[PDB]
């Protein structure tokens, strides 16, 4: 229940703006595009602004025609079941209820989707179709960005054609380095007025007061951090975060989010190579005193702190960041390279995709491989995108561990084609937390729809290969609990998979116990590498087809699938089609409808992380 800002049309009028770009984003991709489009307004004699549809009354769209050459653009990402992003929720519901007339409104839509989902860019497709039905006229074709390929490139391609169309329609042409903030170094700063990594209110990390959430995370102490796998090929860990006194509620199936810190050595190095003093206390105030975002991140603060807690310094810099940096490359060929990274075709496009994206070169890596690139630290901090929270499937039951949130994660570390060893931000940070001054992890809980059945007699079929075992340790703790409580619990099956029982069989002992005690009716483990051929969880599902069909069709069984690989989820889904087709019996097509029907009925749940 946020307090809506005043009419954005009136705001546009007052600031002389004629184009507004709204973003339907969840993890910032769409926000960045909207901001990039809004910044483009200038290059064409127009003045724009970006905005969060949740903070406004979209009904005011009907007043947009009161501004000459007015235009509204929508950058929307599609989520769970072709649903809108949280922030675009009210807009979505509204578009369904309203009879409002938008005659004279000119709009354009760029959708962010993926093709590896049942409803590709549903949101974008809807916003674009609905706006026309209400009477608004499309000024440029709907953009169907695909994140399965390179969304960034699609955006660039769409955009390179968007503006010429807009210029042609409105009768305006092009006009051939604009900074969003100004630097204000502080000399006398009461130490108590300097942000040191809090996400929200000053000193909120130190003075913790409920309720806790994304904007006011609870600093949970790590009471446990142990190695889960037996071998050393990889490092899988299990942590326990104490949420006592936080008044935080959670149930198995929910995800726990964390705000990490970047590697100090990496931060230190970025400062070193630029010759900048990371310990300078300062602020970056928006040059547009009209905007609401007065700072790119909590200020005043030091660079070190920004680079440490507020900025992303590990993922590959996007085209516009490289483009704005070119100016700081004292070597011609390098300045040229950076400048051409944003090309929509040719060698320039090939270089960004192979040398930047594919090689996973972070900013420091680019500063090293292009020795002439020596930008001022403050302009860099303005260009780098914000550091995001990382999510994890809570690996414990709140009925058994009401005061603790468990995590099961695989540490990320790999060789990038850039030649260096890339480290996962959150997993490295977590791996380093020792129970000891106790080690704290800023966190919060995100409710999900991944839940055990309400009726305890209902059979549960769990499929979780590798790290996907995470949410299931909670389910098993819970089901075992329901039994201890004397209640009647139906069958609980676990289809787990790993490479070798002696390499990475997670929770081998715990699972063994649950099975012996009957908490786990069946412990089916696929050891993918203990023989020449691959053996995965679906092969076991196929093996037990007769019993699973009995549990599903006549037992009311609920199915759960969790893990990284989207392909694994598809393979598992395919096996269920075949099981249903065989024992119905029924044709493949009907088996597909049957299984997809289990989903819409809440009997087939997924928690895929890719
Ligand atoms: C809802 C949800 C639930 C999840 N649950 C868990 C969980 O419970 N347990 C768990 O282990 N993870 C889980 N994750 C993944 C987790 O959120 C993080 O993405 C993961 O821990 C890595 O984060 P990080 O900051 O350590 O690495 P980051 O710095 O975020 O780097 C991640 C990126 O590195 C790149 N990358 C990784 N390996 C390679 C490679 N070898 N070659 C090239 N590029 C590579 C990819 O772009 C990958 O996206 C879940 C994710 C989501 C969204
Ligand atoms: C970034 C970070 C983590 C994971 N990933 C992706 O997620 C995958 C799994 O990660 P993890 O942490 O669970 O470690 P993992 O060891 O890769 O776990 C996957 C387990 O299931 C097997 N498997 C592989 N493909 C399968 C499939 N198509 N269907 C069913 N099972 C399959 C694997 O066997 P084999 O390995 O022997 O095939 C292994 O036993 C990684 O392999 C990678 O694809 C990316
Ligand atoms: C949990 C989750 C669910 C998604 N569901 C869909 C979907 O149904 N359809 C689709 O086209 N894309 C889907 N996507 C892909 C996103 O729309 C795409 O990655 C978008 O770039 C994210 O933008 P954002 O960072 O602005 O939220 C999903 C991504 C996640 C993480």
């Amino acid at each position: 229940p946020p307090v809506k800002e005043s009419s954005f049309v009136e705001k546009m009028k007052k600031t002389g703006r004629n184009i507004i770009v709204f973003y339907g984003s969840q993890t910032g991709t769409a926000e960045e595009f909207a901001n990039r489009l809004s910044k483009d307004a200038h290059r064409y004699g127009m003045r724009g602004m970006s905005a969060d549809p949740e903070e406004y009354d979209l009904a005011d769209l009907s007043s947009l025609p009161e501004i000459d050459k007015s235009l509204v653009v929508f950058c929307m990402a599609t989520y769970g079941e072709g649903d809108p992003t949280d922030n675009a929720q009210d807009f979505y519901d509204w578009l369904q209820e309203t009879d409002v007339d938008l005659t004279g409104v000119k709009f354009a839509v760029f959708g962010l989707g993926n093709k590896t989902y049942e409803h590709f860019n549903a949101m974008g497709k809807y916003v674009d179709q609905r706006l026309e039905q209400l009477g608004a006229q499309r000024i440029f074709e709907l953009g169907l960005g695909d994140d399965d390929g390179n969304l960034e490139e699609d955006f660039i391609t769409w955009r390179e054609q968007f503006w010429p169309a807009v210029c042609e329609f409105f009768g305006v042409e092009a006009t051939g380095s604009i900074r969003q903030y100004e630097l204000v170094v502080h000399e006398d700063m009461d130490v108590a007025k300097v942000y040191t990594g809090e996400m929200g209110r000053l000193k909120s990390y130190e003075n913790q007061k409920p309720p806790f959430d994304a904007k006011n995370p609870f600093l949970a102490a790590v009471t446990a951090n142990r190695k889960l796998n037996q071998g050393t090929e990889r490092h899988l860990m299990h942590l326990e975060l104490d949420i006592s006194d936080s008044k935080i509620r959670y149930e198995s199936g929910d995800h726990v989010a964390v705000y990490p810190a970047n590697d100090s050595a990496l931060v230190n190095q970025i400062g070193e190579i630029l010759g900048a003093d990371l310990d300078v206390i300062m602020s970056l105030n928006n040059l547009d005193e009209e905007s609401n975002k007065k700072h790119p991140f909590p200020c005043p603060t030091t660079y070190r702190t920004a680079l440490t807690y507020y900025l992303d310094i590990t993922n590959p810099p996007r085209t516009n960041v490289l483009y704005e940096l070119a100016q700081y490359a004292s070597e011609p060929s390098e300045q040229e390279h950076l400048h051409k990274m944003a090309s929509s075709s040719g060698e320039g496009k090939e270089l960004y995709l192979s040398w930047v994206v594919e090689a996973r070169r972070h900013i420091l890596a680019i500063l090293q491989d292009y020795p002439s690139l020596r930008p001022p630290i403050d302009h860099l901090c303005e260009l780098l995108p914000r550091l995001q929270a990382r999510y994890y499937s809570i690996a414990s039951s709140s009925k058994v561990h009401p005061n603790s949130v468990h995590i099961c994660a695989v540490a990320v570390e790999y060789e990038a084609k850039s030649g260096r060893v890339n480290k996962g931000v959150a997993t490295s940070w977590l791996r380093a937390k020792e129970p000891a001054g106790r080690a704290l992890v800023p966190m919060f809980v995100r409710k999900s729809q991944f839940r055990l059945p309400f009726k305890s007699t209902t059979p549960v079929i769990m499929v979780g290969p590798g790290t996907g075992i995470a949410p299931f340790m909670g389910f098993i703790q819970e089901r075992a609990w329901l039994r201890e409580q004397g209640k009647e619990v139906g069958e609980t099956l676990l289809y787990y998979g790993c490479r070798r029982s002696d390499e990475d069989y997670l929770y081998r002992e715990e699972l063994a116990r649950f099975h012996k005690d009957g908490a786990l009716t069946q412990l089916n483990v696929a050891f993918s590498r203990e023989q020449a051929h691959k053996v995965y969880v679906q092969h076991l599902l196929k093996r037990d087809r007769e019993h699973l069909w009995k549990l599903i069709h006549e037992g009311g069984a609920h199915i759960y699938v969790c893990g990284f690989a989207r392909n694994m989820a598809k393979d598992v889904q395919n096996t269920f089609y075949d099981i249903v087709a065989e024992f119905g019996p029924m044709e493949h097509t009907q088996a597909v409808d049957y299984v997809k029907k289990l989903m819409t009925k809440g009997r087939y749940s997924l928690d895929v992380w890719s």
Side-chain angles (χ1 to χ4, degrees), residues 255 360 390-393 408-410 412 414 423-427 446 467 470 564 609:
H255 302 96
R360 301 283 311 174
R390 269 63 176 183
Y391 288 79
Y392 296 95
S393 304
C408 173
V410 48
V412 169
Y414 58 101
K423 301 288 287 293
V425 182
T427 54
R446 207 248 303 277
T467 312
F564 278 105
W609 314 329

PDB file of all heavy atoms in Angstrom, residues 255 360 390-393 408-410 412 414 423-427 446 467 470 564 609, ligand 1:
ATOM      1  N   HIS A 255      11.784 -19.067  -0.283  1.00  0.00           N
ATOM      2  CA  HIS A 255      13.170 -18.763  -0.595  1.00  0.00           C
ATOM      3  C   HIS A 255      13.686 -17.718   0.386  1.00  0.00           C
ATOM      4  O   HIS A 255      12.917 -16.893   0.873  1.00  0.00           O
ATOM      5  CB  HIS A 255      13.291 -18.200  -2.012  1.00  0.00           C
ATOM      6  CG  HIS A 255      12.757 -19.108  -3.067  1.00  0.00           C
ATOM      7  ND1 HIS A 255      11.483 -18.985  -3.576  1.00  0.00           N
ATOM      8  CD2 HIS A 255      13.302 -20.191  -3.667  1.00  0.00           C
ATOM      9  CE1 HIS A 255      11.264 -19.955  -4.443  1.00  0.00           C
ATOM     10  NE2 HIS A 255      12.351 -20.702  -4.517  1.00  0.00           N
ATOM     11  N   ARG A 360      32.981 -13.580 -20.099  1.00  0.00           N
ATOM     12  CA  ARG A 360      32.597 -13.203 -18.752  1.00  0.00           C
ATOM     13  C   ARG A 360      33.596 -12.226 -18.124  1.00  0.00           C
ATOM     14  O   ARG A 360      33.894 -12.307 -16.929  1.00  0.00           O
ATOM     15  CB  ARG A 360      32.470 -14.461 -17.888  1.00  0.00           C
ATOM     16  CG  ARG A 360      31.442 -15.478 -18.393  1.00  0.00           C
ATOM     17  CD  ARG A 360      30.032 -15.028 -18.070  1.00  0.00           C
ATOM     18  NE  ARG A 360      29.954 -14.645 -16.665  1.00  0.00           N
ATOM     19  CZ  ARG A 360      28.894 -14.092 -16.080  1.00  0.00           C
ATOM     20  NH1 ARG A 360      27.783 -13.845 -16.771  1.00  0.00           N
ATOM     21  NH2 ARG A 360      28.951 -13.787 -14.792  1.00  0.00           N
ATOM     22  N   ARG A 390      20.755 -12.469  -3.704  1.00  0.00           N
ATOM     23  CA  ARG A 390      20.744 -13.806  -4.271  1.00  0.00           C
ATOM     24  C   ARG A 390      19.718 -14.599  -3.470  1.00  0.00           C
ATOM     25  O   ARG A 390      19.592 -14.416  -2.254  1.00  0.00           O
ATOM     26  CB  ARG A 390      22.120 -14.471  -4.161  1.00  0.00           C
ATOM     27  CG  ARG A 390      23.044 -14.244  -5.355  1.00  0.00           C
ATOM     28  CD  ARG A 390      23.414 -12.776  -5.572  1.00  0.00           C
ATOM     29  NE  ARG A 390      24.375 -12.661  -6.667  1.00  0.00           N
ATOM     30  CZ  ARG A 390      24.943 -11.529  -7.079  1.00  0.00           C
ATOM     31  NH1 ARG A 390      24.654 -10.372  -6.498  1.00  0.00           N
ATOM     32  NH2 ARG A 390      25.805 -11.562  -8.087  1.00  0.00           N
ATOM     33  N   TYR A 391      18.989 -15.471  -4.160  1.00  0.00           N
ATOM     34  CA  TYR A 391      17.957 -16.291  -3.537  1.00  0.00           C
ATOM     35  C   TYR A 391      18.364 -17.749  -3.363  1.00  0.00           C
ATOM     36  O   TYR A 391      19.147 -18.293  -4.146  1.00  0.00           O
ATOM     37  CB  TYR A 391      16.660 -16.227  -4.352  1.00  0.00           C
ATOM     38  CG  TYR A 391      15.931 -14.910  -4.259  1.00  0.00           C
ATOM     39  CD1 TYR A 391      16.346 -13.805  -4.996  1.00  0.00           C
ATOM     40  CD2 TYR A 391      14.841 -14.766  -3.407  1.00  0.00           C
ATOM     41  CE1 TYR A 391      15.691 -12.576  -4.885  1.00  0.00           C
ATOM     42  CE2 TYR A 391      14.179 -13.554  -3.280  1.00  0.00           C
ATOM     43  CZ  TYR A 391      14.605 -12.455  -4.019  1.00  0.00           C
ATOM     44  OH  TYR A 391      13.953 -11.244  -3.868  1.00  0.00           O
ATOM     45  N   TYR A 392      17.801 -18.380  -2.340  1.00  0.00           N
ATOM     46  CA  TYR A 392      18.097 -19.771  -2.030  1.00  0.00           C
ATOM     47  C   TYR A 392      16.856 -20.456  -1.475  1.00  0.00           C
ATOM     48  O   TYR A 392      16.111 -19.857  -0.714  1.00  0.00           O
ATOM     49  CB  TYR A 392      19.234 -19.810  -1.011  1.00  0.00           C
ATOM     50  CG  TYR A 392      20.513 -19.237  -1.566  1.00  0.00           C
ATOM     51  CD1 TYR A 392      20.866 -17.907  -1.344  1.00  0.00           C
ATOM     52  CD2 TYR A 392      21.339 -20.011  -2.378  1.00  0.00           C
ATOM     53  CE1 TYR A 392      22.019 -17.363  -1.931  1.00  0.00           C
ATOM     54  CE2 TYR A 392      22.485 -19.479  -2.966  1.00  0.00           C
ATOM     55  CZ  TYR A 392      22.822 -18.164  -2.746  1.00  0.00           C
ATOM     56  OH  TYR A 392      23.952 -17.658  -3.363  1.00  0.00           O
ATOM     57  N   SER A 393      16.616 -21.698  -1.877  1.00  0.00           N
ATOM     58  CA  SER A 393      15.448 -22.431  -1.380  1.00  0.00           C
ATOM     59  C   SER A 393      15.715 -22.857   0.058  1.00  0.00           C
ATOM     60  O   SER A 393      16.602 -23.679   0.316  1.00  0.00           O
ATOM     61  CB  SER A 393      15.184 -23.671  -2.235  1.00  0.00           C
ATOM     62  OG  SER A 393      15.025 -23.300  -3.585  1.00  0.00           O
ATOM     63  N   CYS A 408      21.358 -24.487   1.378  1.00  0.00           N
ATOM     64  CA  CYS A 408      22.121 -25.527   0.704  1.00  0.00           C
ATOM     65  C   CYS A 408      22.558 -24.943  -0.631  1.00  0.00           C
ATOM     66  O   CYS A 408      21.749 -24.809  -1.557  1.00  0.00           O
ATOM     67  CB  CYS A 408      21.248 -26.760   0.485  1.00  0.00           C
ATOM     68  SG  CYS A 408      22.023 -28.027  -0.499  1.00  0.00           S
ATOM     69  N   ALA A 409      23.841 -24.611  -0.743  1.00  0.00           N
ATOM     70  CA  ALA A 409      24.343 -23.989  -1.955  1.00  0.00           C
ATOM     71  C   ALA A 409      25.662 -24.534  -2.480  1.00  0.00           C
ATOM     72  O   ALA A 409      26.516 -25.003  -1.710  1.00  0.00           O
ATOM     73  CB  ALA A 409      24.480 -22.505  -1.717  1.00  0.00           C
ATOM     74  N   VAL A 410      25.823 -24.474  -3.801  1.00  0.00           N
ATOM     75  CA  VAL A 410      27.066 -24.908  -4.420  1.00  0.00           C
ATOM     76  C   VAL A 410      27.893 -23.654  -4.672  1.00  0.00           C
ATOM     77  O   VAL A 410      27.413 -22.699  -5.296  1.00  0.00           O
ATOM     78  CB  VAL A 410      26.845 -25.637  -5.774  1.00  0.00           C
ATOM     79  CG1 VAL A 410      25.889 -24.848  -6.657  1.00  0.00           C
ATOM     80  CG2 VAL A 410      28.175 -25.779  -6.500  1.00  0.00           C
ATOM     81  N   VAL A 412      30.217 -21.116  -6.395  1.00  0.00           N
ATOM     82  CA  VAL A 412      30.530 -20.898  -7.797  1.00  0.00           C
ATOM     83  C   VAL A 412      31.968 -20.428  -7.930  1.00  0.00           C
ATOM     84  O   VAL A 412      32.410 -19.546  -7.199  1.00  0.00           O
ATOM     85  CB  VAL A 412      29.583 -19.869  -8.426  1.00  0.00           C
ATOM     86  CG1 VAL A 412      30.085 -19.461  -9.805  1.00  0.00           C
ATOM     87  CG2 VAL A 412      28.199 -20.473  -8.539  1.00  0.00           C
ATOM     88  N   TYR A 414      34.885 -20.911 -11.432  1.00  0.00           N
ATOM     89  CA  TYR A 414      35.052 -21.544 -12.737  1.00  0.00           C
ATOM     90  C   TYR A 414      36.105 -20.771 -13.523  1.00  0.00           C
ATOM     91  O   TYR A 414      36.490 -19.666 -13.147  1.00  0.00           O
ATOM     92  CB  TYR A 414      33.796 -21.656 -13.598  1.00  0.00           C
ATOM     93  CG  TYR A 414      33.169 -20.296 -13.862  1.00  0.00           C
ATOM     94  CD1 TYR A 414      33.366 -19.632 -15.075  1.00  0.00           C
ATOM     95  CD2 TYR A 414      32.430 -19.642 -12.874  1.00  0.00           C
ATOM     96  CE1 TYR A 414      32.842 -18.342 -15.294  1.00  0.00           C
ATOM     97  CE2 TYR A 414      31.906 -18.358 -13.083  1.00  0.00           C
ATOM     98  CZ  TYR A 414      32.118 -17.712 -14.289  1.00  0.00           C
ATOM     99  OH  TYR A 414      31.650 -16.422 -14.464  1.00  0.00           O
ATOM    100  N   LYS A 423      34.657 -15.740  -9.525  1.00  0.00           N
ATOM    101  CA  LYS A 423      34.083 -16.185  -8.264  1.00  0.00           C
ATOM    102  C   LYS A 423      32.640 -15.685  -8.123  1.00  0.00           C
ATOM    103  O   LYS A 423      32.335 -14.538  -8.457  1.00  0.00           O
ATOM    104  CB  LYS A 423      34.914 -15.655  -7.092  1.00  0.00           C
ATOM    105  CG  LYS A 423      36.374 -16.101  -7.100  1.00  0.00           C
ATOM    106  CD  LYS A 423      36.510 -17.568  -6.751  1.00  0.00           C
ATOM    107  CE  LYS A 423      36.254 -17.828  -5.271  1.00  0.00           C
ATOM    108  NZ  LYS A 423      37.306 -17.213  -4.420  1.00  0.00           N
ATOM    109  N   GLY A 424      31.766 -16.561  -7.631  1.00  0.00           N
ATOM    110  CA  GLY A 424      30.373 -16.203  -7.420  1.00  0.00           C
ATOM    111  C   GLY A 424      30.342 -15.272  -6.231  1.00  0.00           C
ATOM    112  O   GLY A 424      30.945 -15.563  -5.190  1.00  0.00           O
ATOM    113  N   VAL A 425      29.649 -14.151  -6.376  1.00  0.00           N
ATOM    114  CA  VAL A 425      29.590 -13.163  -5.310  1.00  0.00           C
ATOM    115  C   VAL A 425      29.031 -13.676  -3.986  1.00  0.00           C
ATOM    116  O   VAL A 425      29.727 -13.671  -2.961  1.00  0.00           O
ATOM    117  CB  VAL A 425      28.764 -11.946  -5.747  1.00  0.00           C
ATOM    118  CG1 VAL A 425      28.749 -10.903  -4.629  1.00  0.00           C
ATOM    119  CG2 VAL A 425      29.351 -11.358  -7.047  1.00  0.00           C
ATOM    120  N   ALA A 426      27.775 -14.115  -4.014  1.00  0.00           N
ATOM    121  CA  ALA A 426      27.109 -14.591  -2.815  1.00  0.00           C
ATOM    122  C   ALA A 426      27.670 -15.891  -2.247  1.00  0.00           C
ATOM    123  O   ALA A 426      27.797 -16.020  -1.029  1.00  0.00           O
ATOM    124  CB  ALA A 426      25.608 -14.737  -3.066  1.00  0.00           C
ATOM    125  N   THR A 427      28.008 -16.853  -3.105  1.00  0.00           N
ATOM    126  CA  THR A 427      28.523 -18.105  -2.580  1.00  0.00           C
ATOM    127  C   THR A 427      29.937 -18.008  -2.014  1.00  0.00           C
ATOM    128  O   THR A 427      30.263 -18.718  -1.062  1.00  0.00           O
ATOM    129  CB  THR A 427      28.397 -19.263  -3.604  1.00  0.00           C
ATOM    130  OG1 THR A 427      29.009 -18.908  -4.851  1.00  0.00           O
ATOM    131  CG2 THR A 427      26.922 -19.587  -3.821  1.00  0.00           C
ATOM    132  N   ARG A 446      11.133 -14.573   0.995  1.00  0.00           N
ATOM    133  CA  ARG A 446      10.204 -14.352  -0.111  1.00  0.00           C
ATOM    134  C   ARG A 446       9.275 -15.548  -0.153  1.00  0.00           C
ATOM    135  O   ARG A 446       9.709 -16.675  -0.399  1.00  0.00           O
ATOM    136  CB  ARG A 446      10.979 -14.254  -1.427  1.00  0.00           C
ATOM    137  CG  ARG A 446      10.321 -13.427  -2.536  1.00  0.00           C
ATOM    138  CD  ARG A 446       9.871 -14.282  -3.713  1.00  0.00           C
ATOM    139  NE  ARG A 446      10.930 -15.078  -4.349  1.00  0.00           N
ATOM    140  CZ  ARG A 446      11.778 -14.635  -5.276  1.00  0.00           C
ATOM    141  NH1 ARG A 446      11.724 -13.379  -5.705  1.00  0.00           N
ATOM    142  NH2 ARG A 446      12.675 -15.460  -5.797  1.00  0.00           N
ATOM    143  N   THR A 467      21.892 -30.047  -6.173  1.00  0.00           N
ATOM    144  CA  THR A 467      21.536 -29.017  -5.210  1.00  0.00           C
ATOM    145  C   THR A 467      20.033 -28.820  -5.078  1.00  0.00           C
ATOM    146  O   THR A 467      19.568 -28.231  -4.111  1.00  0.00           O
ATOM    147  CB  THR A 467      22.183 -27.696  -5.602  1.00  0.00           C
ATOM    148  OG1 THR A 467      23.566 -27.928  -5.883  1.00  0.00           O
ATOM    149  CG2 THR A 467      22.072 -26.696  -4.478  1.00  0.00           C
ATOM    150  N   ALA A 470      17.703 -29.102  -1.912  1.00  0.00           N
ATOM    151  CA  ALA A 470      17.481 -28.055  -0.922  1.00  0.00           C
ATOM    152  C   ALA A 470      16.107 -27.855  -0.269  1.00  0.00           C
ATOM    153  O   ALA A 470      15.970 -28.011   0.952  1.00  0.00           O
ATOM    154  CB  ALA A 470      17.881 -26.706  -1.519  1.00  0.00           C
ATOM    155  N   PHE A 564      18.598 -26.648 -10.859  1.00  0.00           N
ATOM    156  CA  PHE A 564      19.095 -25.621 -11.764  1.00  0.00           C
ATOM    157  C   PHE A 564      18.625 -25.791 -13.207  1.00  0.00           C
ATOM    158  O   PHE A 564      17.957 -24.924 -13.751  1.00  0.00           O
ATOM    159  CB  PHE A 564      20.625 -25.603 -11.767  1.00  0.00           C
ATOM    160  CG  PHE A 564      21.223 -24.839 -10.625  1.00  0.00           C
ATOM    161  CD1 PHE A 564      21.800 -25.509  -9.551  1.00  0.00           C
ATOM    162  CD2 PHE A 564      21.174 -23.451 -10.604  1.00  0.00           C
ATOM    163  CE1 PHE A 564      22.320 -24.816  -8.469  1.00  0.00           C
ATOM    164  CE2 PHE A 564      21.693 -22.742  -9.525  1.00  0.00           C
ATOM    165  CZ  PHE A 564      22.271 -23.434  -8.445  1.00  0.00           C
ATOM    166  N   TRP A 609      15.719 -23.025 -10.968  1.00  0.00           N
ATOM    167  CA  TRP A 609      16.507 -21.811 -10.809  1.00  0.00           C
ATOM    168  C   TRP A 609      17.172 -21.202 -12.050  1.00  0.00           C
ATOM    169  O   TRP A 609      18.028 -20.323 -11.934  1.00  0.00           O
ATOM    170  CB  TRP A 609      17.569 -22.059  -9.743  1.00  0.00           C
ATOM    171  CG  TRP A 609      17.019 -22.714  -8.537  1.00  0.00           C
ATOM    172  CD1 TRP A 609      15.755 -22.586  -8.040  1.00  0.00           C
ATOM    173  CD2 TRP A 609      17.722 -23.568  -7.634  1.00  0.00           C
ATOM    174  NE1 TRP A 609      15.627 -23.303  -6.881  1.00  0.00           N
ATOM    175  CE2 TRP A 609      16.820 -23.917  -6.606  1.00  0.00           C
ATOM    176  CE3 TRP A 609      19.030 -24.070  -7.591  1.00  0.00           C
ATOM    177  CZ2 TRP A 609      17.181 -24.745  -5.548  1.00  0.00           C
ATOM    178  CZ3 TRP A 609      19.388 -24.890  -6.541  1.00  0.00           C
ATOM    179  CH2 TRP A 609      18.467 -25.221  -5.533  1.00  0.00           C
TER     180      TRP A 609
HETATM  181  C1  LIG B   1      14.717 -18.799  -6.787  1.00  0.00           C
HETATM  182  C2  LIG B   1      16.015 -19.295  -6.823  1.00  0.00           C
HETATM  183  C3  LIG B   1      16.384 -20.337  -5.977  1.00  0.00           C
HETATM  184  C4  LIG B   1      17.710 -20.747  -5.903  1.00  0.00           C
HETATM  185  N1  LIG B   1      18.073 -21.642  -4.972  1.00  0.00           N
HETATM  186  C5  LIG B   1      19.370 -21.930  -4.793  1.00  0.00           C
HETATM  187  C6  LIG B   1      19.753 -22.845  -3.819  1.00  0.00           C
HETATM  188  O1  LIG B   1      18.992 -23.129  -2.895  1.00  0.00           O
HETATM  189  N2  LIG B   1      21.060 -23.351  -3.809  1.00  0.00           N
HETATM  190  C7  LIG B   1      21.993 -22.902  -4.752  1.00  0.00           C
HETATM  191  O2  LIG B   1      23.121 -23.393  -4.794  1.00  0.00           O
HETATM  192  N3  LIG B   1      21.610 -21.944  -5.699  1.00  0.00           N
HETATM  193  C8  LIG B   1      20.291 -21.477  -5.732  1.00  0.00           C
HETATM  194  N4  LIG B   1      19.974 -20.424  -6.499  1.00  0.00           N
HETATM  195  C9  LIG B   1      21.040 -19.759  -7.284  1.00  0.00           C
HETATM  196  C10 LIG B   1      21.494 -18.507  -6.529  1.00  0.00           C
HETATM  197  O3  LIG B   1      20.413 -17.575  -6.460  1.00  0.00           O
HETATM  198  C11 LIG B   1      22.701 -17.834  -7.185  1.00  0.00           C
HETATM  199  O4  LIG B   1      22.422 -17.519  -8.553  1.00  0.00           O
HETATM  200  C12 LIG B   1      23.923 -18.750  -7.092  1.00  0.00           C
HETATM  201  O5  LIG B   1      24.150 -19.095  -5.724  1.00  0.00           O
HETATM  202  C13 LIG B   1      25.141 -18.015  -7.657  1.00  0.00           C
HETATM  203  O6  LIG B   1      25.243 -16.737  -7.024  1.00  0.00           O
HETATM  204  P1  LIG B   1      26.672 -16.052  -6.730  1.00  0.00           P
HETATM  205  O7  LIG B   1      26.466 -14.610  -6.459  1.00  0.00           O
HETATM  206  O8  LIG B   1      27.560 -16.883  -5.889  1.00  0.00           O
HETATM  207  O9  LIG B   1      27.301 -16.108  -8.213  1.00  0.00           O
HETATM  208  P2  LIG B   1      27.107 -14.884  -9.242  1.00  0.00           P
HETATM  209  O10 LIG B   1      28.191 -13.903  -9.012  1.00  0.00           O
HETATM  210  O11 LIG B   1      25.702 -14.429  -9.150  1.00  0.00           O
HETATM  211  O12 LIG B   1      27.349 -15.577 -10.673  1.00  0.00           O
HETATM  212  C14 LIG B   1      26.331 -16.382 -11.274  1.00  0.00           C
HETATM  213  C15 LIG B   1      26.558 -16.416 -12.786  1.00  0.00           C
HETATM  214  O13 LIG B   1      27.867 -16.912 -13.097  1.00  0.00           O
HETATM  215  C16 LIG B   1      27.803 -17.406 -14.446  1.00  0.00           C
HETATM  216  N5  LIG B   1      28.393 -18.761 -14.384  1.00  0.00           N
HETATM  217  C17 LIG B   1      28.252 -19.715 -13.267  1.00  0.00           C
HETATM  218  N6  LIG B   1      29.156 -20.791 -13.717  1.00  0.00           N
HETATM  219  C18 LIG B   1      29.594 -20.504 -14.942  1.00  0.00           C
HETATM  220  C19 LIG B   1      30.422 -21.198 -15.721  1.00  0.00           C
HETATM  221  N7  LIG B   1      30.984 -22.269 -15.168  1.00  0.00           N
HETATM  222  N8  LIG B   1      30.810 -20.761 -16.927  1.00  0.00           N
HETATM  223  C20 LIG B   1      30.334 -19.527 -17.382  1.00  0.00           C
HETATM  224  N9  LIG B   1      29.466 -18.823 -16.540  1.00  0.00           N
HETATM  225  C21 LIG B   1      29.118 -19.324 -15.346  1.00  0.00           C
HETATM  226  C22 LIG B   1      26.327 -17.459 -14.815  1.00  0.00           C
HETATM  227  O14 LIG B   1      25.950 -16.296 -15.568  1.00  0.00           O
HETATM  228  C23 LIG B   1      25.648 -17.426 -13.459  1.00  0.00           C
HETATM  229  O15 LIG B   1      24.344 -16.849 -13.618  1.00  0.00           O
HETATM  230  C24 LIG B   1      18.681 -20.114  -6.675  1.00  0.00           C
HETATM  231  C25 LIG B   1      18.307 -19.091  -7.538  1.00  0.00           C
HETATM  232  C26 LIG B   1      16.980 -18.677  -7.610  1.00  0.00           C
HETATM  233  C27 LIG B   1      16.629 -17.604  -8.423  1.00  0.00           C
END
